[PDB]
From Swiss-Prot:
Subcellular location, principal: cytoplasm
Lineage of the organism: Bacteria, Pseudomonadati, Pseudomonadota, Gammaproteobacteria, Enterobacterales
Subunit composition and interactions: Homodimer. Interacts with the pole-localizer protein TmaR. Binding to TmaR is reversible as long as TmaR can get phosphorylated, whereas binding to non-phosphorylated TmaR is very strong and shifts the equilibrium toward binding.
Gene: ptsI
Protein name listed in UniProt: Phosphoenolpyruvate-protein phosphotransferase
Annotated function: General (non sugar-specific) component of the phosphoenolpyruvate-dependent sugar phosphotransferase system (sugar PTS). This major carbohydrate active-transport system catalyzes the phosphorylation of incoming sugar substrates concomitantly with their translocation across the cell membrane. Enzyme I transfers the phosphoryl group from phosphoenolpyruvate (PEP) to the phosphoryl carrier protein (HPr). Can also use (Z)-3-fluoro-PEP (ZFPEP), (Z)-3-methyl-PEP (ZMePEP), (Z)-3-chloro-PEP (ZClPEP) and (E)-3-chloro-PEP (EClPEP) as alternative phosphoryl donors.
Subcellular location: Cytoplasm
Comment, domains: The N-terminal domain contains the HPr binding site, the central domain the pyrophosphate/phosphate carrier histidine, and the C-terminal domain the pyruvate binding site.
Gene Ontology cellular-component terms listed: cytosol
Family membership: Belongs to the PEP-utilizing enzyme family.
Protein's UniProt keywords contain Kinase: yes
Top-level taxon in the UniProt lineage: Bacteria
Length: 259
């Protein structure tokens, strides 16, 4: 009964790939002047990584969708390498004895919160794009593990509460079989992918992430706008024939030569 908004029609079979995230724990402990010097190297040299990460993703955005998307990630690096937000972070770590994780979170706490005080969905939706830049920066300071979605080797379905341009900029469109997310969809960056690529997808799933686990066997219908979870062979075998009869009845468009 999973009623979504249906992005594009089509039918695909594959295992559920649930993208879960480990909650990050920030340490609010005060360090000693003997560990402050290390925070700067962890942050200074750390930025060497975050700068290299987004940079590497920046080229994937231009080599995957094309140039016009590089300008968006190009400014996202300027904000991260901002010499101004740099002096403020440093000072805090040294003046408030804050950890690069805590101090870095403070600045990012006002950049996102301050944009929420604006009355414009454009600068606001930027708040979500800005927080995403801090999240990665945090996982880099703690060297936390990063989810490598651009390294899939088995064809499966993609399930997630929602995906940000970055994830979509590095996603692999050669091993993915479809995109399923519970995001309103009105103007969800996901839909724009499913629409320009005409591939089949759904976005208003709502709580499928609370009904499916990863590895779960699913079947996307994108015809009746419905997803089947753990279906009996009777329904699979029965659809496999009719279903493929559609792709073949579609290849009947290849037969659009009789006319």
């Amino acid at each position: 009964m999973i009623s979504g908004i249906l992005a594009s029609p089509g039918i695909a079979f594959g295992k559920a790939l649930l993208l879960k995230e480990d909650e990050i724990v920030i340490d609010r402990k005060k360090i000693s002047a003997d560990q402050v010097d290390q925070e700067v190297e962890r942050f200074l040299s750390g930025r060497a990584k975050a700068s290299a990460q987004l940079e590497t993703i920046k080229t994937k955005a231009g080599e995957t969708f094309g140039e016009e998307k590089e300008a968006i990630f190009e400014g996202h690096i300027m904000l991260l390498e901002d010499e101004e937000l740099e002096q403020e972070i440093i000072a805090l770590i040294k003046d408030k004895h804050m950890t690069a994780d805590a101090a870095a979170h403070e600045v990012i706490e006002g950049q996102a919160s301050a944009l929420e005080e604006l009355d414009d969905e454009y600068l606001k939706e930027r708040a979500a794009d800005v927080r995403d830049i801090g999240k990665r920066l945090l996982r880099n300071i703690l060297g936390l593990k990063i989810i490598d979605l651009s390294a899939i080797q088995d064809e499966v379905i993609l399930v997630a509460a929602d995906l940000t341009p970055s994830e979509t900029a590095q996603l692999n469109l050669k091993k993915v079989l479809g995109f399923i997310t519970d995001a309103g969809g009105r103007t969800s960056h996901t839909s724009i992918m499913a629409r320009s690529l005409e591939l089949p997808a759904i976005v208003g799933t709502g709580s499928v992430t609370s009904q499916v686990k990863n590895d779960d066997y699913l079947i996307l219908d994108a015809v009746n706008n419905q997803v089947y979870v753990n279906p009996t062979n009777e329904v699979i075998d029965k659809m496999r024939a009719v279903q493929e009869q559609v792709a073949s009845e579609k290849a009947e468009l290849a037969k659009l030569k009789d006319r």
